[PDB]
Design a protein around this ligand. Structure first.
Ligand SMILES: Cc1noc(C)c1-c1ccc2c(c1)nc([C@@H]1CCCC(=O)N1c1cccc(C(C)(C)C)c1)n2[C@H]1CC[C@@H](NC(=O)OC(C)(C)C)CC1
Length: 114
């Protein structure tokens, strides 16, 4: 049974790795705002929105008990973006860049956590 400070120390470097991907992480730093973006169908398509600010806040305040719940949220944000956006769009290709980065950093940390 993990403690939320153990979880934060080990997983937060993987989250900071995402934030550094400038400009790729910019669309993902805050919730998608469908009104601002003019995309009224977004919450029809994305039933469980997620973004970097929400994951950071959940990490910071201890809302994850096990590491796979953090991993699930990160992949939720990618899958939402791959689902809603066309393959030709910048955010789609941005999402693939951050997903590539993420797999690269999450593997060793998950194996030392377990
Ligand atoms: C993910 C995802 N999944 O589906 C969807 C849908 C998203 C998603 C999400 C956001 C998005 C977005 C797509 N396209 C944009 C803008 C909007 C115009 C069109 C465009 O080409 N863009 C764009 C895309 C890729 C890269 C960038 C940079 C690198 C220039 C920044 C821009 N943005 C925000 C819109 C406003 C955000 N600023 C903000 O919220 O400011 C406050 C003060 C916090 C409210 C920052 C980028």
């Amino acid at each position: 049974i993990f403690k939320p400070e153990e979880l934060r120390q080990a997983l937060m470097p993987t989250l900071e790795a995402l934030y550094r991907q400038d400009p790729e992480s910019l669309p993902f730093r805050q919730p998608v705002d469908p009104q601002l973006l003019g995309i009224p169908d977004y919450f029809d398509i994305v039933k469980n929105p997620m973004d970097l600010s929400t994951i950071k806040r959940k990490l910071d305040t201890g809302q994850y008990q096990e590491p796979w719940q953090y991993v699930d949220d990160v992949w939720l944000m990618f899958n939402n973006a791959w689902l809603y956006n066309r393959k030709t769009s910048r955010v789609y290709k941005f999402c693939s860049k951050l997903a590539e980065v993420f797999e690269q950093e999450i593997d060793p940390v998950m194996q030392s956590l377990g």
